[PDB]
Design a protein around this motif. Structure first.
Motif, PDB file in Angstrom:
ATOM      1  N   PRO A  23       0.802  -1.250   0.000  1.00 32.80           N
ATOM      2  CA  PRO A  23       0.000   0.000   0.000  1.00 32.80           C
ATOM      3  C   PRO A  23       0.822   1.283   0.000  1.00 32.80           C
ATOM      4  O   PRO A  23       0.361   2.303  -0.529  1.00 32.80           O
ATOM      5  CB  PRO A  23      -0.833  -0.097   1.286  1.00 32.80           C
ATOM      6  CG  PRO A  23      -0.153  -1.079   2.125  1.00 32.80           C
ATOM      7  CD  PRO A  23       0.513  -2.053   1.206  1.00 32.80           C
TER       8      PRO A  23
ATOM      9  N   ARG B 181       3.384   1.899  -1.739  1.00 29.83           N
ATOM     10  CA  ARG B 181       3.801   2.149  -3.129  1.00 29.83           C
ATOM     11  C   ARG B 181       2.668   2.405  -4.098  1.00 29.83           C
ATOM     12  O   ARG B 181       2.912   2.737  -5.273  1.00 29.83           O
ATOM     13  CB  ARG B 181       4.711   1.020  -3.614  1.00 29.83           C
ATOM     14  CG  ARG B 181       5.892   0.849  -2.691  1.00 29.83           C
ATOM     15  CD  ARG B 181       6.935   1.921  -2.958  1.00 29.83           C
ATOM     16  NE  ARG B 181       8.185   1.212  -2.998  1.00 29.83           N
ATOM     17  CZ  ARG B 181       9.144   1.363  -3.873  1.00 29.83           C
ATOM     18  NH1 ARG B 181       9.094   2.345  -4.770  1.00 29.83           N
ATOM     19  NH2 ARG B 181      10.229   0.627  -3.788  1.00 29.83           N
ATOM     20  N   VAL B 182       1.421   2.309  -3.590  1.00 36.76           N
ATOM     21  CA  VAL B 182       0.212   2.468  -4.394  1.00 36.76           C
ATOM     22  C   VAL B 182      -0.532   3.744  -4.019  1.00 36.76           C
ATOM     23  O   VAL B 182      -1.130   3.806  -2.952  1.00 36.76           O
ATOM     24  CB  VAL B 182      -0.673   1.187  -4.355  1.00 36.76           C
ATOM     25  CG1 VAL B 182      -1.888   1.334  -5.263  1.00 36.76           C
ATOM     26  CG2 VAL B 182       0.134  -0.056  -4.753  1.00 36.76           C
ATOM     27  N   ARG B 183      -0.458   4.775  -4.890  1.00 40.26           N
ATOM     28  CA  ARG B 183      -1.110   6.064  -4.658  1.00 40.26           C
ATOM     29  C   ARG B 183      -2.636   5.844  -4.586  1.00 40.26           C
ATOM     30  O   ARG B 183      -3.319   6.393  -3.727  1.00 40.26           O
ATOM     31  CB  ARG B 183      -0.767   7.040  -5.807  1.00 40.26           C
ATOM     32  CG  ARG B 183      -0.508   8.514  -5.431  1.00 40.26           C
ATOM     33  CD  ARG B 183      -1.706   9.296  -4.959  1.00 40.26           C
ATOM     34  NE  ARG B 183      -1.821   9.260  -3.499  1.00 40.26           N
ATOM     35  CZ  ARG B 183      -2.957   9.441  -2.829  1.00 40.26           C
ATOM     36  NH1 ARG B 183      -4.093   9.680  -3.478  1.00 40.26           N
ATOM     37  NH2 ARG B 183      -2.968   9.362  -1.499  1.00 40.26           N
ATOM     38  N   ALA B 184      -3.152   5.028  -5.507  1.00 42.14           N
ATOM     39  CA  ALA B 184      -4.561   4.682  -5.637  1.00 42.14           C
ATOM     40  C   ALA B 184      -4.631   3.456  -6.525  1.00 42.14           C
ATOM     41  O   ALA B 184      -3.693   3.173  -7.260  1.00 42.14           O
ATOM     42  CB  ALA B 184      -5.344   5.852  -6.250  1.00 42.14           C
TER      43      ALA B 184
ATOM     44  N   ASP C  89       1.160  -0.538   5.787  1.00 46.27           N
ATOM     45  CA  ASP C  89       0.654   0.830   5.938  1.00 46.27           C
ATOM     46  C   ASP C  89      -0.339   1.240   4.876  1.00 46.27           C
ATOM     47  O   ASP C  89       0.022   1.409   3.713  1.00 46.27           O
ATOM     48  CB  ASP C  89       1.822   1.835   6.049  1.00 46.27           C
ATOM     49  CG  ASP C  89       1.535   3.165   6.755  1.00 46.27           C
ATOM     50  OD1 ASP C  89       0.381   3.631   6.714  1.00 46.27           O
ATOM     51  OD2 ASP C  89       2.480   3.770   7.263  1.00 46.27           O
ATOM     52  N   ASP C  90      -1.600   1.394   5.288  1.00 47.30           N
ATOM     53  CA  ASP C  90      -2.692   1.819   4.424  1.00 47.30           C
ATOM     54  C   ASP C  90      -3.250   3.176   4.859  1.00 47.30           C
ATOM     55  O   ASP C  90      -4.390   3.505   4.535  1.00 47.30           O
ATOM     56  CB  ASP C  90      -3.799   0.739   4.372  1.00 47.30           C
ATOM     57  CG  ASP C  90      -4.346   0.311   5.731  1.00 47.30           C
ATOM     58  OD1 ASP C  90      -3.724   0.651   6.757  1.00 47.30           O
ATOM     59  OD2 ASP C  90      -5.351  -0.425   5.758  1.00 47.30           O
TER      60      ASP C  90
ATOM     61  N   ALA D 215       6.678   5.096   2.508  1.00 44.31           N
ATOM     62  CA  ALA D 215       7.008   4.419   1.250  1.00 44.31           C
ATOM     63  C   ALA D 215       8.276   5.043   0.648  1.00 44.31           C
ATOM     64  O   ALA D 215       9.198   4.319   0.290  1.00 44.31           O
ATOM     65  CB  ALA D 215       5.847   4.512   0.267  1.00 44.31           C
TER      66      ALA D 215
ATOM     67  N   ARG E 137       0.573   7.199   4.083  1.00 44.48           N
ATOM     68  CA  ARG E 137       1.504   6.080   3.861  1.00 44.48           C
ATOM     69  C   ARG E 137       2.697   6.404   2.948  1.00 44.48           C
ATOM     70  O   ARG E 137       3.751   5.803   3.113  1.00 44.48           O
ATOM     71  CB  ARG E 137       0.770   4.812   3.344  1.00 44.48           C
ATOM     72  CG  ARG E 137       0.188   4.926   1.926  1.00 44.48           C
ATOM     73  CD  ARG E 137      -0.907   3.899   1.709  1.00 44.48           C
ATOM     74  NE  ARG E 137      -1.596   4.018   0.418  1.00 44.48           N
ATOM     75  CZ  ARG E 137      -2.653   4.794   0.197  1.00 44.48           C
ATOM     76  NH1 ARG E 137      -3.145   5.549   1.166  1.00 44.48           N
ATOM     77  NH2 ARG E 137      -3.240   4.801  -0.994  1.00 44.48           N
TER      78      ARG E 137
END
Ligand SMILES: Cn1cc(-c2ccc3c(c2)[C@@](C)(Cc2ccccc2)C(=O)N3)cn1
Ligand SMILES: Cn1cc(-c2ccc3c(c2)[C@@](C)(Cc2ccccc2)C(=O)N3)cn1
Lengths: 546, 546
Positions: free
Chosen positions: A348, A350-353, B127-128, B136, B132
């Motif tokens: 999560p 590394r994931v913006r959306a 981490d959500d 990252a 986050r």
């Protein structure tokens, strides 16, 4: 007979015209009529404005020369300019207000599609203002749709001088009778008419367009809704990142802004996003359209385990690491949609959306084997046929043109049974040897996919399906987690495998989930309904992904 | 004998430790001692925190479980928590405050340079949180400096359980005696000690580092200032854009944020920016390091005219067009610095900001031929030798290793005369056949340039000098203009060709010009003084380029 069309920028391809703001300012400030339009043209061919348009001086240098011309003009008319009068403010606002004239661009696009050579011919300036980027963006969007862009400040020639016209003819490599010329200024239209060119004085777009269709014999007005701009593979920036000794990932890259990583499905390509790439980049994003591992210019190792979700996700993390990106928004379709949900669950940070087209997020049942779960739904029976190494490869690689023509079809164009495939001896049993061309694709687009699959075939792509047990075991580690980062689920009414109802319980795991739904849309979402996909993605990106 | 070093993250590689914020909150809120640290560890191996660290649940799911544990703990101690008490706020602030422990990272970097296998072993969470990305980014910066990163939430094992230690040993492929293990928690250090590993309890960094150098026999404390992080070519994202039928441009890409286009000089490579790429990407920019036309993986057509400034600039505009970038900041060195000034003069709308290393902006004299101007300065006499097609090519391509070793040297390391070159019969006359290795470069770095120049040789690179008359004529069109977009001039004290004094009158044309100056710096600015270049560029980018 006409074969080239030429358009002015101000008042023709872009509206409201920057020229008309001088008359608007006068009326707004109750100044003598033509006072500003007179200070603007002061000196004629030897004046500040002509020097600016020829490129002798920049816009920021012309501003003080215009202010002095405004002082000299108000002096003669025996009047006084207001306290907070600013030419910079007037032009900053006028430039910012001026937008692309969409119907004129559509007519130019249609003319080029029919074989016309198109060009923009404009009297413009070298913009060095702090706010120059707005115009740079406008010019960029516009120019890419034409064969030529002739700017007065770059050629050191100006309309209405006859040299610019002979130059235009030389660049077009056409005689004057072969050229239509559209301009909102009569004086600038005059030399093209006098040379033998067909001319159109542009006031309202509709009449100008009626005159244009009458003279070209091509329907330009009231025409059907055009498809979004596509991608020419040879005109793209191609990127290559080695994620491990034997693995390199290829991607196509366009735009600036937040990184948006597009992940295709099976058996696809970065090209499956052809209609989304220009639109997302134009909406203010840096698009990275992948060739997923096993596809196109990316590496395709033979080993089944190289294609389990764990390995694929780890490699997508390394891809970001190597490009120096702390995050990207991840948008996936089909197998790419599955990867994207696991990117959100496992990385999560590394994931913006996250956004998925068709693929729902369905949590692993730890009390049931995936093989048991797949068997319950006859919809997934065709995937059992993909299990045995070499079997589906041989049939899918037998005739590539047939493979893609049979697969890539709209909901009403089905040519494949896709039920009892594993019990009938093949995917292509009772399917035409020479399928008709789907309304979704051109022959040229199919041949692109054919050319891409000639490098590695179907082994790597098919391996994405051969990791059911490994993926299930990995997914079970995430059973206590929820997806709490921004998320979008896009359903396609007529996808008969990845049915909209399969996504129904997703809110249990993704409580903040946003949705999109496309009617009369089959499995190949991006090419089936490109306009709606773009509308849905851009709206969600702007509200949830920054 | 030791060959692997292992570091914890919290309290070891990153400070202030997130753990210590529970004790700080207690003292700040005058709550019973250990109240928060007790609610944090409630349930032990079966509790909320252990589930979080093993990856069973995400951080956002743990927050309400921690709040309830804080309620249960305050109940037993017979106290009350404040009105606006928030675990999320406490942890958001603690995570945001925690930064890389630079001396610890430097010690780990030094150990790896000497041949050690390094790893981070950490008890962490999935981490959500909406925020986050900060973590990252931190994890991304850190991980790339180590061979392995083992996170508890990804492996489903936690310190102090013995399984995580045997797993660490398995990943390191080393016996316990070969491993140093650094941790700030004594209990977590215990199983590694009990296994036979060398251990260090980390309190203050300095003592931990003294213990580390005593046991490895490698100096880690009070060591010289390290060079900035460089680039491993095989670990980069490689990008390719066709700008016209016969021309493709290659670039290396790293980072997110505003596009920063790096343009090398003669006879260089994208690799000349090796020390700037990781630093600019880490500073919040999307770096595009070009192979300029004629170099490395970019196209090298033979025709002289393909290398005039007009053509090169037009192609750089098309490069941006194809990538979907409305602008980029342009940073150039030597011939790249010349291109960058002309990009600002001719395409200001496409130039976010402009910076040049060594190359000044000098306006064209329309009353003097460039050949006349060059002859006035004996410093540029060597460029007359580059004029005759084939002559310089033959000498520069004769022995590549000799060519680069002779060229790429610091100010005090000169091995080439570079005066009366055209009158002595060559660039390498009275120069060693086997030059010594400069303090600026390794043999490996020279061999990279040798390998790149094996593809196209020196023809395309030399052609950049063969367009004097064409460039002068083009530059004369811009004589009435000024550069009014953000601009930086970086001078190098000891560049004896592109002397700092040549830049003295630049403010006449660029009134808002900013400056940088590097002392004891020769021509090869980026590799000569990488730390100062990065400091100067990052500072200017952050203040003037957004
Ligand atoms: C309910 N349902 C599952 C599927 C399904 C179909 C094919 C595959 C999978 C799930 C996973 C992702 C394996 C997997 C299975 C179950 C849960 C997680 C992952 C795989 O590797 N291939 C379709 N409907
Ligand atoms: C004063 N000075 C000029 C130079 C000089 C040296 C080499 C070259 C040039 C200028 C231009 C850019 C041509 C050019 C010459 C003059 C003005 C603009 C452009 C070129 O194409 N090669 C060094 N000192």
């Amino acid at each position: 007979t006409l074969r080239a069309a030429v358009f002015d920028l101000d008042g023709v391809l872009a509206l409201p015209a920057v020229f008309g703001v001088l008359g608007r300012t006068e009326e707004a400030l109750a100044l003598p009529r033509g006072l500003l339009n007179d200070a603007f043209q002061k000196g004629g061919p030897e004046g500040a404005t002509t020097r600016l348009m020829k490129g002798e001086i920049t816009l920021s240098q012309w501003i003080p020369l215009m202010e002095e011309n405004c002082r000299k003009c108000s002096e003669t008319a025996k009047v006084c300019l207001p306290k907070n009068f600013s030419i910079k403010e007037i032009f900053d606002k006028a430039i910012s207000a001026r937008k692309i004239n969409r119907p004129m661009l559509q007519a130019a696009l249609m003319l080029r599609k029919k074989g016309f050579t198109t060009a923009i011919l404009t009297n413009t300036w070298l913009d060095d203002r702090a706010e120059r980027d707005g115009l740079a963006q406008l010019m960029c969007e516009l120019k890419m749709h034409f064969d030529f862009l002739i700017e007065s400040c770059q050629v050191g020639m100006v309309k209405p001088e006859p040299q610019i016209y002979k130059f235009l003819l030389d660049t077009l490599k056409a005689s004057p009778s072969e050229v239509v010329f559209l301009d909102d200024i009569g004086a600038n239209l005059k030399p093209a008419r006098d040379l033998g060119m067909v001319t159109i004085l542009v006031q309202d777009t509709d009449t100008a367009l009626k005159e244009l269709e009458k003279v070209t014999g091509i329907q330009l007005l009231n025409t059907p809704a055009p498809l979004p701009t596509s991608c020419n593979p040879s005109d793209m920036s191609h990127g290559y990142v080695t994620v491990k000794p034997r693995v390199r990932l290829h991607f196509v890259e366009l735009g600036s802004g937040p990184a948006v990583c597009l992940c295709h499905g099976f058996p696809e390509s970065w090209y499956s996003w052809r209609y989304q790439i220009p639109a997302l980049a134009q909406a203010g994003y840096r698009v990275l359209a992948m060739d997923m591992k096993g596809y196109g210019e990316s590496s395709a190792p033979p080993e089944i385990e190289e294609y389990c979700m764990e390995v694929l996700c780890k490699e997508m993390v390394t891809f970001l690491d190597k490009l120096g990106l702390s995050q990207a928004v991840f948008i996936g379709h089909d197998w790419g949609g599955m990867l994207v949900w696991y990117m959100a669950l496992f990385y999560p940070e590394r994931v913006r959306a996250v956004a998925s087209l068709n693929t729902p997020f369905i949590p692993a049942n730890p009390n049931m084997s995936p093989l048991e779960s797949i068997k319950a739904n006859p919809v997934f029976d065709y995937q059992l046929y993909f299990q045995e190494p070499g079997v589906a490869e041989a049939e899918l690689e037998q005739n590539l043109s047939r493979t893609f023509k049979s697969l890539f079809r709209a909901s009403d164009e089905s040519v494949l049974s896709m039920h009892k495939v594993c019990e009938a001896g093949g995917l292509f049993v009772n399917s035409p040897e020479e399928p008709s061309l789907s309304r979704m694709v051109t022959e040229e687009e199919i041949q692109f996919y054919v050319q891409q699959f000639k490098k590695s075939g179907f082994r790597g792509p098919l391996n994405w399906y051969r990791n059911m047990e490994r993926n299930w075991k990995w997914a079970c580690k995430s059973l206590g987690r929820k997806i709490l980062i921004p998320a979008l689920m896009v359903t396609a009414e007529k996808d008969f495998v990845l049915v909209p109802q399969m996504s129904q319980h997703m809110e249990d795991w993704i409580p903040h989930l946003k949705r999109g739904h496309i009617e009369d849309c089959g499995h190949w979402t991006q090419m089936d309904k490109p306009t709606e996909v773009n509308q849905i993605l851009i709206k969600w990106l702007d509200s949830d992904a920054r």
